[PDB]
Amino acid sequence: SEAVKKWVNKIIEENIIAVFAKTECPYCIKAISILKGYNLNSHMHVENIEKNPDMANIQAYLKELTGKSSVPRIFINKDVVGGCDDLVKENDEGKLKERLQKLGLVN
Ligand SMILES: [Mn+2]
Ligand SMILES: [Mn+2]
Ligand SMILES: [Mn+2]
Ligand SMILES: [Mn+2]
């Protein structure tokens, strides 16, 4: 579905930080909390793709874009971060802060 890809794309392209999640998902919650800890709320969108009639289509497209169909799936300025484990690696190693600095999102 062109429609599903266009919908996913609009989420990624109109929000600097885009997180695809599902219901009662501990690593989604952890990833979102880490990002909100950088005070990124105003430029974040979280989409619950389980509460969606086209979840499988969305997951397959996210896999085409990122290599995995699992949630959370995290994009920053359209760049693929990946999942929560990828976010933790970037956070601990300074890469996340560098990304956000280059976007003007953290001083
Ligand atoms: Mn349950
Ligand atoms: Mn804060
Ligand atoms: Mn939003
Ligand atoms: Mn939404």
Side-chain angles (χ1 to χ4, degrees), residues 1 3-50 52-101 103-106:
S1 187
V4 166
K5 293 179 179 179
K6 289 167 184 168
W7 178 90
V8 169
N9 287 348
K10 285 277 160 147
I11 292 167
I12 298 169
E13 294 185 279
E14 298 182 343
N15 304 282
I16 296 182
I17 315 296
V19 180
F20 297 87
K22 71 175 170 184
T23 310
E24 294 171 8
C25 170
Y27 287 98
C28 303
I29 294 161
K30 183 184 174 84
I32 292 163
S33 185
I34 289 172
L35 289 158
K36 292 191 171 177
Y38 281 93
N39 196 31
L40 302 177
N41 312 46
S42 62
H43 289 287
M44 285 174 67
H45 189 70
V46 175
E47 190 66 33
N48 180 341
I49 67 170
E50 182 173 7
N52 193 293
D54 301 312
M55 183 188 189
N57 303 127
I58 297 164
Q59 287 183 268
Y61 185 41
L62 292 172
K63 192 177 186 177
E64 293 176 4
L65 292 179
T66 71
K68 295 190 179 165
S69 55
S70 54
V71 288
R73 290 281 91 210
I74 305 164
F75 301 78
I76 295 185
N77 193 32
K78 293 169 283 178
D79 298 316
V80 177
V81 173
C84 187
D85 292 0
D86 298 307
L87 186 69
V88 164
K89 177 176 175 52
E90 288 203 7
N91 193 32
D92 288 8
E93 293 176 352
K95 174 82 162 104
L96 178 55
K97 191 183 95 157
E98 286 179 278
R99 281 187 199 274
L100 301 174
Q101 286 178 317
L103 297 164
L105 291 171
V106 303

